[PDB]
Design a binder for this molecule. Sequence first.
Ligand SMILES: CC[C@H]1CNCc2ccc(NC(=O)c3ccc4cc(C(=N)N)ccc4c3)cc21
Length: 245
Amino acid sequence: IIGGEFTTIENQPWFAAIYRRHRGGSVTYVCGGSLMSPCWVISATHCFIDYPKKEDYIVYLGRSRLNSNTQGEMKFEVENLILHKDYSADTLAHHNDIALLKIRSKEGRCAQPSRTIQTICLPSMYNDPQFGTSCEITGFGKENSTDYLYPEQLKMTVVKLISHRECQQPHYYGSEVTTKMLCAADPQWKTDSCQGDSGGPLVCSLQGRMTLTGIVSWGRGCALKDKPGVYTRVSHFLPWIRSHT
Ligand SMILES: CC[C@H]1CNCc2ccc(NC(=O)c3ccc4cc(C(=N)N)ccc4c3)cc21
């Protein structure tokens, strides 16, 4: 997250920190995720397509810092990694960038809700928020494009949804952004999500209910002028989410 403010997991109870074990034992942060139900986390397929082995992944909930055990957290492994079978990736845009991870603790249990571990509701058929609505994002991604390290503390920011016809204009993304995607950004272009935040939640207050409207997918640079962040439109994939869970 570029700009924005630091925060703690108690503010983002459904955020999931997804790590991966390397050869030798070293472990590095990969992508973010959102808790759908006690046993399920939804993220982005491009975060796993290169190393499709469910065994190498570690998932944390109620964890507020990159390298510190936060009072109340729960460590998990992945019982099942399901990737969207029709996924692909062009020069900038990503398609059907959605994934499901069925989690399980060493004792064989799913997540146990607490003050710092909660689920977020999915959207309903054809009912997305109008353009211009403010929504928030959270992640452990770069604070600046030039950094090579990720911020030690969790961060979040607020951006505004952008209409599809506006996101398809020449100086934006043209025909590269389809109807299955949503754009969002900062009007002054000072804050935005960035590499390291992929797979994370785009939550919107819709009709009085916090709703997982998007999943961080792609974008040209970070916080660049006329270059919004692009997110997977969850509402479109409801049938897929239902059938695979
Ligand atoms: C080596 C990394 C790699 C693995 N193979 C597929 C793949 C594929 C992709 C990404 N994602 C990004 O690197 C990335 C970069 C910039 C971003 C900018 C925004 C934004 N402007 N809000 C949103 C998401 C981003 C993701 C990473 C990787």
